[PDB]
């Protein structure tokens, strides 16, 4: 996260670290949506152009963390993957359309002060909150600059951007399954996700019921925190029928 700040303890208790076993490194962010299910970006697991194709045995999920590098004894929980489910129409060839994946844990994780699931939006949630200028929050252990790494989880709040502005900022074809967020050059504030943060959550706190909802997944961008560029996010509500289908079947 570029131009963010240290998270408070327990501020993002749904935050998940996807941790590569060998070599030991941060792969991506992710989120906890139940005791058994973790949400992330498909590109964290599958991206053939870079020969990325993780299997369940390649990675671990670390939940309840604050420190990036430390083994947080008596606090974090480490979980193994039973199965990965990538959206079948994830468009890795072109524009990362439908950049979403689910991972089922081998055993359910116990909730605690540090570990707790985020809500997923329904249609009404999405209509109410996904409006230009409304702010959400992105968290992660990714790089602090495009070109280093944080001691603890970082947070930044960023406004949703008008769709024409998003479309005009990039040559990539934008779909209804994406939105963009970030400050404009003229706005003076800064902030973005970066390498290590992708797959993590973009959340908003409903002013109606005071709950946090995961509206987006960090999907893609061009560099990090560049003037006139915006981060792109997978639109979680738009892909909820698939999420429900997978959870209902498996």
């Amino acid at each position: 996260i570029v131009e963010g700040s240290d998270a408070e303890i327990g501020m993002s208790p749904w935050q998940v670290m996807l941790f590569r076993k060998s070599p030991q490194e941060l792969l991506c962010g992710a989120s906890l949506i139940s005791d058994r299910w973790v949400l992330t970006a498909a590109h964290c697991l599958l991206y053939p152009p870079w020969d990325k194709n993780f299997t369940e045995n390649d990675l671990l999920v670390r939940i309840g963390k604050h420190s990036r590098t430390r083994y947080e004894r008596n606090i974090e929980k480490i979980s193994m993957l039973e199965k990965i489910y990538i959206h079948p129409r994830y468009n890795w060839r072109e524009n990362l359309d439908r950049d979403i994946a689910l991972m089922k844990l081998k055993k359910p994780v116990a909730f605690s002060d540090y570990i707790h699931p985020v809500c997923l939006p329904d249609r009404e949630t999405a209509a109410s909150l996904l409006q230009a200028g409304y702010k959400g929050r992105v968290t992660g252990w990714g790089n602090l600059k495009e070109t280093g790494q944080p001691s603890v989880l970082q947070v930044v709040n960023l406004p949703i951007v008008e769709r024409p502005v998003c479309k005009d900022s990039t040559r990539i074809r934008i779909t209804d399954n994406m939105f963009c967020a970030g400050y404009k050059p003229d706005e003076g504030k800064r902030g973005d996700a970066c390498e290590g943060d992708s797959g993590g959550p973009f959340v908003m706190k409903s002013p109606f019921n005071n709950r946090w909802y995961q509206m987006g997944i960090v999907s893609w961008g061009e560099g990090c925190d560049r003037d006139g560029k915006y981060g792109f996010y997978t639109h979680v509500f738009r892909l909820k029928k698939w999420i429900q289908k997978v959870i209902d079947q498996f």
Partner: peptide, 28 residues
Amino acid sequence: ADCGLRPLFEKKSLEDKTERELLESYID
């Protein structure tokens, strides 16, 4: 049932340092 309500914040009626920034942006 309790999704999205943080033990160390909403559950105990404490607010984090920047959630007000989000609220203030929700103007419609």
